Amino acid sequence: TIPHLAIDPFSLDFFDDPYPDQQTLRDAGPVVYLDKWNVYGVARYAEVHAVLNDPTTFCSSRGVGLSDFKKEKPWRPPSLILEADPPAHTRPRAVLSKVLSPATMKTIRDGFAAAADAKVDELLQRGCIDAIADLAEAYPLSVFPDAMGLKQEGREHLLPYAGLVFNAFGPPNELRQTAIERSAPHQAYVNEQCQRPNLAPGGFGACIHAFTDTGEITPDEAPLLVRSLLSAGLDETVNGIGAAVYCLARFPGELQRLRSDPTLARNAFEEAVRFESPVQTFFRTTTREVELGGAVIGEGEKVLMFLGSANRDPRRWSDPDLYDITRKTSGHVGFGSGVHMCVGQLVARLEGEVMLSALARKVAAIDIDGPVKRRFNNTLRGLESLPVKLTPA
Numbered sequence: 001t002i003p004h005l006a007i008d009p010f011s012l013d014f015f016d017d018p019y020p021d022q023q024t025l026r027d028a029g030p031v032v033y034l035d036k037w038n039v040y041g042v043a044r045y046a047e048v049h050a051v052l053n054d055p056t057t058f059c060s061s062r063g064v065g066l067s068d069f070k071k072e073k074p075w076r077p078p079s080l081i082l083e084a085d086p087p088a089h090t091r092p093r094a095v096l097s098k099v100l101s102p103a104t105m106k107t108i109r110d111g112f113a114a115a116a117d118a119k120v121d122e123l124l125q126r127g128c129i130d131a132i133a134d135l136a137e138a139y140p141l142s143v144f145p146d147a148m149g150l151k152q153e154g155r156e157h158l159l160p161y162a163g164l165v166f167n168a169f170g171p172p173n174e175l176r177q178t179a180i181e182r183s184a185p186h187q188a189y190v191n192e193q194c195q196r197p198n199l200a201p202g203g204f205g206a207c208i209h210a211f212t213d214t215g216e217i218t219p220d221e222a223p224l225l226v227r228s229l230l231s232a233g234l235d236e237t238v239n240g241i242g243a244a245v246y247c248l249a250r251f252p253g254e255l256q257r258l259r260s261d262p263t264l265a266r267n268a269f270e271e272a273v274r275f276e277s278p279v280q281t282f283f284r285t286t287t288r289e290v291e292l293g294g295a296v297i298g299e300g301e302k303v304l305m306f307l308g309s310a311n312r313d314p315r316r317w318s319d320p321d322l323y324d325i326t327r328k329t330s331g332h333v334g335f336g337s338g339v340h341m342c343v344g345q346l347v348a349r350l351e352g353e354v355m356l357s358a359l360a361r362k363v364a365a366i367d368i369d370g371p372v373k374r375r376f377n378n379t380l381r382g383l384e385s386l387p388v389k390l391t392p393a
């Protein structure tokens with residue numbers, strides 16, 4: 001009943017061009033079996049959306065990577081929120097939703113917008129820049145570590161740790177093992193900055209510690225919650241912004257539209273999050289024998305969700321290979337869906353929007369003048385290098 005496919009969704013051949021293999025996964029059926037790693041796969045929007053919204057059947061406490069925590073020791077102490085299920089997940093989730101609240105976005109927006117404007121001015125002075133290192137990477141590193149109250153020393157560990165977290169969700173390929181080996185320095189730095197005395201007052205980290213008084217979390221849970229904001233929220237926004245810049249380059253007509261109405265910047269970034277989907281895959285583990293789309297999945301089985309393919313499903317999207325800044329992107333699963341939907345989606349959209357706002361008002365054209373290099377990760381899709389030339393507006 002269930003087709004078995006030999007496609008390796010975590011291979012370098014897959015990462016370089018996943019879209020043909022993704023149609024093959026969608027068209028093979030609503031549930032595929034992937035012999036390479038002995039997991040179930042779902043690639044259509046309908047089934048990816050259904051598993052994300054059935055947390056009781058498709059749990060997260062047994063890991064959201066390939067590894068089954070009930071079977072193997074996790075490479076690090078499990079996340080208090082991403083790798084938890086209700087009710088254990090509920091009160092840590094409420095804390096992060098209040099720390100990263102709409103009320104919190106008002107205190108940082110003008111600081112995040114001003115730094116996005118100054119960065120674009122800075123790169124327009126240099127003309128030919130690397131949109132990844134000098135823009136996609138440079139900007140969020142100039143606002144987010146400060147917004148969390150991180151000290152200046154050691155910030156070079158942040159990106160290496162971020163890419164390690166997402167490589168570790170993957171299978172035991174050499175991408176994951178090279179990242180886990182010699183990961184001790186980044187782990188040591190991140191763990192120490194989780195302690196309250198190292199978090200500047202007013203930042204995200206100190207705010208999370210301030211929530212121990214409420215009875216929502218205890219003091220010993222606070223550092224691990226801080227760890228989530230140092231593991232997630234950097235590498236996804238970098239790839240997300242680098243994709244938007246890449247899209248504006250390959251679709252110059254969309255850049256001219258954003259230039260004519262810069263209030264499209266927030267949706268221009270949202271459509272870029274659907275179009276590229278920086279987080280490409282996440283896992284769930286079955287707690288039951290479940291009937292999924294006419295296909296029976298047993299207990300304790302890993303189910304791989306293809307979020308990027310679900311965002312390009314022609315059964316759900318009109319012309320999904322097209323970048324449309326005016327597309328009604330509502331319902332995409334780049335940020336997830338349900339009880340685990342990104343808790344930091346407001347920070348990402350804010351970072352993305354103010355950058356695309358700055359570009360819309362200062363740049364006339366964005367032209368690629370150099371070899372584009374892909375960045376390879378077990379979980380993230382994004383560019384390694386995007387040589388661009390910016391023409392001032």
Ligand code: HEM
Pocket residue numbers: 060064081082083093096100228229232233234236237240273277278279282307333334335336337339340341342343344345347348
């Ligand atoms: C382009 C930007 C981003 C993308 C594409 C993205 C993607 C995702 C996705 C798909 C999930 C769901 C995981 C699951 O259901 O298993 C998630 C959860 C999460 N994200 Fe994001 N994210 C982004 C930005 C951020 C930011 C800015 C932060 C923090 C400041 C953040 C922190 C988190 C956390 C803590 C969770 C776990 C929430 C939970 O388990 O309830 N992410 N993210």
Ligand SMILES: COc1ccc(C(=O)O)cc1
Pocket residue numbers: 079080081082083165227228229231232233279
């Ligand atoms: C979606 O990416 C992540 C990665 C790590 C965590 C976490 O540390 O809880 C959450 C989300």
